[PDB]
Design a protein around this nucleic acid. Structure first.
Lengths: 196, 199, 25, 129, 86, 103, 98, 110
RNA sequence: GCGAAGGCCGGGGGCUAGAAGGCGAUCAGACACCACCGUAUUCCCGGCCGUAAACGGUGCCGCCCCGCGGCCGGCGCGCGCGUCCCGCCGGCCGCCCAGGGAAACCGGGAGGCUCCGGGCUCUGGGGGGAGUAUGGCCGCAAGGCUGAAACUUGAAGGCAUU
């Protein structure tokens, strides 16, 4: 991890988590605020972002990774992530049958998946499990990891926090393959990914 | 024929060697044309059994539709049981055949005692349950044959299991449930971790 | 309550059968 | 009350394997439990097991490798004649080639194959396949 | 010493040998459609770039339904070196 | 053609399907053949074999639907057959409901 | 078969509860199987409320509220529409409507 | 008063996006002439054409003021894209303490 | 040994309701529902009785098992310090991952079971006839408990779909 990213995550509120928690999610949680908000150790969050990035880089066709989100705040972030890292995008409704119905107008057979919220995108994860497709998801303290192969701890609700996490991932995916070096900071700003 | 799935498109190239390759990656087969690609000589043996007339009561009267069940398999190591329902007996048989080819699964097979050469029995005691009926497929000596109910016997001839000792538990008069059970047991043939596959 | 009424009818008839045996023996 | 120490142990191992847990704890440790597990460790079905001392019945932390499929006990332990062993193996174990039936013998707790080689039979403690 | 059922000749018989789940050592059956085989890349000391070679990880449908795959993966990656044990 | 096939003892499904494909190859959007009478039974059935899209009502039924009725005679008793063929593109007129629209 | 898990009454850790009488039908129903709706209505009708206040000589008078608990049997409640036959899924919803 | 049929409605939505520049919002007669060109739209039937042209007029008044779903406006698309690709200057986003100290980064400490 | 209610046997007591009984309606009839009057009863004491859809229609003791909440009792840990918070143990619950089941559903089991074995008790074996008959025991009685056969019939039953 780097110091600049930590301060950016602190203004992101990525560390902040919901007042409800899951036993599987406890490893990531660092501590609980007096109100009940569960902070996440940012270093543990970062290790997930880079571990997930390595898996995203192992696909030969980057346009065969489907990024799906129903959350309104997540819409801009997923599209920006798809522009910077070539990838299929599903904005708004997932549309049932997208991954299982051959005659779907949006028929995509992906070899990975990205979902902003396990709850808001329950249908997407369910279909990925019908066709052998892995799944990577951004997860808050109440995380049902059923059918979620890899999960990145984050607020995932705050509009800004959703934007930074996709930017932190886009950035690192692009760096691992080539493009921007990890020495040279990305020209694109994470405020582009966040939607007012 | 135009391949509809990115797997069927790798099968139109010939990139896939054998049905077993796909089974080792547990892939879902969606086009019956892919099974036909790996079965060139007159496809594979197919049998129609239990064509049932099912009636839905309407205001006007009962709507009779036909549920056919079809087993497809080579006489070596593959078995698929599928079912279709159509008002036309023939249409349902075609749908059943298509479903049967789509659900073709491998059978491990094995030796009761002597390991002289070709596997002749089931690998272990395999069990499957559909509705009430539960089946028990137990290895048999080379002298024994398929000791099974006529319906289960056809499924074991079309799976390449020469000799097996079988016991059915439940209403095995329901042939749809009966074939389903001996198919689910023959789908567990590659799900059992034996000391042979421990490495 | 036909089953309860059935046992009420039965009890009434067994009581009568006891009375007839009491008249004899 | 706790009539069978071994049954609870092999149930608590099978439940752990189904969950996919690598290590489990057995609340009461017996000498016959250790002998049954030792047989599974010499057959590769289990991994290292450590008996902690609580100064009472003792606990066992068992390591697993996903290899074991089913472990059970036959209760009451029925003495098996030498020529009856094969009839038990044709029902209790899948395949004459794989599996193990653990029987307490005068020589000691041994698998059915070891008992067959020594041509002696004994009371069946349980089975692991 | 090979991973297949053998005969008297010792030739591996049957057909294909099913994958085993990395975390639970459980044979992925032919019709298990929730099984996944995602891989994780490794990075070089200079430039931190992928070596075009990755470690594959097969997970069974059952461990995915359990929801333990996420924790499994980290521990398996830590053993494989890709993740820092921490 | 169907009446001859039925007198040749062709199976009703086989005979009807043969008529349907010939009409579909000639471009009818829908071909429907209905055979009615005592089909190998003393009770009367009415097996209707249809493929594609066929309109049912309106003035377009007069313009776009060719409805032909026969009374094929079998030994057990008269088997009346109706063949209905619908062509939206008959050159002279267009389907009122269809809107051609534009680029 | 068994339509409801609660068996239609809230009896937990109990073998016998008190007996309540349905107000309309005068029947004996257990306390657990009773409608129990508590209503606070003002003593007067809301149409005649303001004119009572104007007429009232006492300054700062507040109109009395009537506090009553109406308990009914299932038959003496479904027929008055206090409770309604629900869909099998809707039956499970325990939240009060509105 | 009379609910429009799905064929009339669907066709009208296709006509409005294709001829958004050609159509005018509050005039049925002006829009009837556009729809009956046998080029940008071929509608058989005088009554069907009149019915489609009337929906089109209603939908055009909606397009100018608070546009509705199913219609693709190139004019709105460029403005939406401009904000979507807009960059917010220096990005304020660029500029739990125990957790920061736990990493050891101790950013902004003291 | 205990055991709701009703019943019974002695003493009392007697407000209400109210098996019976009587009335007024209703209706084709109505000695039913509804109104009205009212005896036993309801209540207490000393006994009998021994039964209920006595139900969680789910025996008892033991082990493991998946999350997520509510409540109740006791206790411990932080913390300003609150009828907080996080546990622990016992109980009562709701949802439910597997898993099971003919399914409804169960999931603190109806899971770990045709891959079947922790211990113990009880009960069932197509539907009637029939809980009848007879014999025994028990009770003052009502009745309880134990409990047939001859003979008859091809279904009875469960759950779910339309």
């Amino acid at each position: 991890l780097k110091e600049a990213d930590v301060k950016k995550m602190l203004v992101a509120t990525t560390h902040l988590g919901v007042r409800n928690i899951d036993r599987r999610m406890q490893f990531y949680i660092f501590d609980r605020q007096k109100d009940g908000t569960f902070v996440f150790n940012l270093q543990k969050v970062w290790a997930k972002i880079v571990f997930a990035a390595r898996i995203l880089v192992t696909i030969d066709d980057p346009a065969e990774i489907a990024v799906v989100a129903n959350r309104p705040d997540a819409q801009r972030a997923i599209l920006k992530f798809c522009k910077y890292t070539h990838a299929t995008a599903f904005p708004g409704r997932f549309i049932p049958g997208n991954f299982t119905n051959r005659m779907n107008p949006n028929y995509c057979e992906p070899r990975l998946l990205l979902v902003n919220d396990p709850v808001v995108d329950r249908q997407a994860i369910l279909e990925a499990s019908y066709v052998n497709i892995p799944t990577i998801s951004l997860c808050n303290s109440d995380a049902n990891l059923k059918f979620i192969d890899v999960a990145i701890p984050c607020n995932n609700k705050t509009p800004m926090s959703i934007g930074l996490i996709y930017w932190l991932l886009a950035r690192e995916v692009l760096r691992l393959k080539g493009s921007i070096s990890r020495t040279e900071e990305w020209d694109v700003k994470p405020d582009l990914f966040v939607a007012l | 024929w135009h391949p509809s799935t990115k797997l069927g498109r790798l099968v139109k190239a010939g990139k896939i060697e054998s049905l077993y390759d796909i089974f080792k990656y547990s892939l879902p087969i969606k086009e019956t044309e892919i099974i036909d690609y790996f079965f060139p000589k007159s496809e594979l043996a197919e049998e129609v059994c239990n064509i049932m007339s099912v009636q839905k009561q309407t205001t006007a009267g009962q709507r009779t539709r036909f549920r056919a069940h079809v087993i497809v398999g080579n006489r070596d190591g593959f078995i698929g049981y599928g079912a279709g329902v159509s008002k036309e007996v023939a249409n349902a048989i075609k749908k059943a055949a298509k479903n049967a080819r789509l659900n073709i699964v491998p059978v491990r097979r094995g030796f009761w005692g002597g390991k002289l050469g070709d596997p002749h029995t089931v690998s272990s005691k395999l069990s499957g349950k559909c509705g009430s009926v539960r089946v028990r497929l137990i290895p048999a000596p080379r002298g024994a044959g398929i000791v099974a109910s006529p319906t289960v016997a056809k499924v074991l001839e079309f799976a390449g299991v020469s000799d097996v000792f079988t016991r059915q538990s439940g209403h095995s008069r329901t042939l749809m449930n009966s074939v389903g059970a001996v198919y689910n047991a023959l789908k567990s043939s590659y799900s059992i971790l034996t000391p042979d596959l421990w490495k | 309550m036909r089953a309860k009424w059935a046992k009420k009818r039965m009890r009434k008839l067994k009581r009568k059968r006891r009375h007839m045996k009491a008249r004899s023996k | 009350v706790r009539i069978n120490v071994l049954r609870d142990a092999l149930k608590s191992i099978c439940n752990a394997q189904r969950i996919g847990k690598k290590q489990v704890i057995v609340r009461p440790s017996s000498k016959v439990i250790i002998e049954f597990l030792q047989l599974m460790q010499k057959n590769g079905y289990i991994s290292d097991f450590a008996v902690v001392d609580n100064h009472r019945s003792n606990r066992i932390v068992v390591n697993l490798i996903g290899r074991l499929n089913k472990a059970g006990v036959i209760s009451p332990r029925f003495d098996i004649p030498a020529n009856d062993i094969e009839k038990w193996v044709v029902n209790l174990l899948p395949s004459r080639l794989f599996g193990h039936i653990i029987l307490t013998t005068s020589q000691g707790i041994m698998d059915h194959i070891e008992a067959q080689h020594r041509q002696i039979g004994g009371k069946v403690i349980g089975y692991f396949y | 010493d090979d991973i297949g059922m053998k005969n008297s000749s010792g030739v591996v018989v049957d057909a294909y040998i099913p994958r085993k789940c990395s975390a639970t050592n459980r044979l992925i059956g032919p019709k298990d459609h929730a099984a996944v085989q995602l891989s994780v890349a490794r990075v070089n000391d200079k430039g931190k770039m992928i070596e075009n070679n990755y470690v594959t990880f097969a997970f069974c449908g059952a461990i995915r339904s359990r929801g333990g795959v996420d924790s499994a993966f980290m521990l398996l990656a830590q053993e494989h070196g890709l993740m820092e044990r921490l | 053609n169907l009446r001859a096939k039925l007198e040749e003892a062709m199976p009703i499904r086989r005979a009807a399907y043969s008529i349907i494909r010939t009409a579909m190859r000639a471009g009818a959007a829908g071909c429907e053949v209905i055979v009615a009478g005592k089909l190998r039974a003393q009770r009367a059935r009415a097996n209707k074999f249809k493929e594609g899209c066929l309109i049912s009502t309106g003035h377009p039924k007069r313009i776009f639907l060719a409805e032909a009725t026969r009374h094929i005679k079998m030994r057990q008793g008269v088997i009346g057959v109706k063949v209905r063929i619908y062509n939206p593109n008959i050159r002279g007129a267009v389907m009122p409901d269809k809107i051609e629209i534009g680029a | 078969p068994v339509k409801r898990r609660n068996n239609g009454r809230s009896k937990y850790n109990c073998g016998h509860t008190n007996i309540v009488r349905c107000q309309n039908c005068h029947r004996c129903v257990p306390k657990d199987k009773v409608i129990k709706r508590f209503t606070i209505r003002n003593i007067v009708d809301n149409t005649i409320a303001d004119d009572v206040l104007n007429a009232c000589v006492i300054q700062g008078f507040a109109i009395p509220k009537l506090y009553n608990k109406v308990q009914y049997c299932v038959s003496c409640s479904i027929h008055n529409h206090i409770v309604r036959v629900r869909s099998r899924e809707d039956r499970k919803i325990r939240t009060p409507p509105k | 008063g009379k609910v429009r049929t799905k064929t009339i409605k669907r066709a009208a939505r296709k006509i409005v996006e294709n001829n958004y520049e050609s159509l005018k919002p509050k005039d049925f007669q002006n829009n009837k002439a556009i729809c009956s060109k046998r080029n940008v739209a071929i509608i058989p039937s005088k009554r069907l054409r009149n019915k489609v042209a009337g929906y089109v007029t209603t939908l055009m008044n909606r397009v100018v003021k608070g546009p509705v779903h199913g219609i693709s406006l190139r004019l709105q698309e460029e403005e939406r894209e401009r904000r979507d690709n807009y960059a917010p200057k220096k990005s304020e986003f660029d500029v739990t303490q125990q957790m920061i100290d736990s990493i050891g980064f101790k950013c902004m400490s003291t």
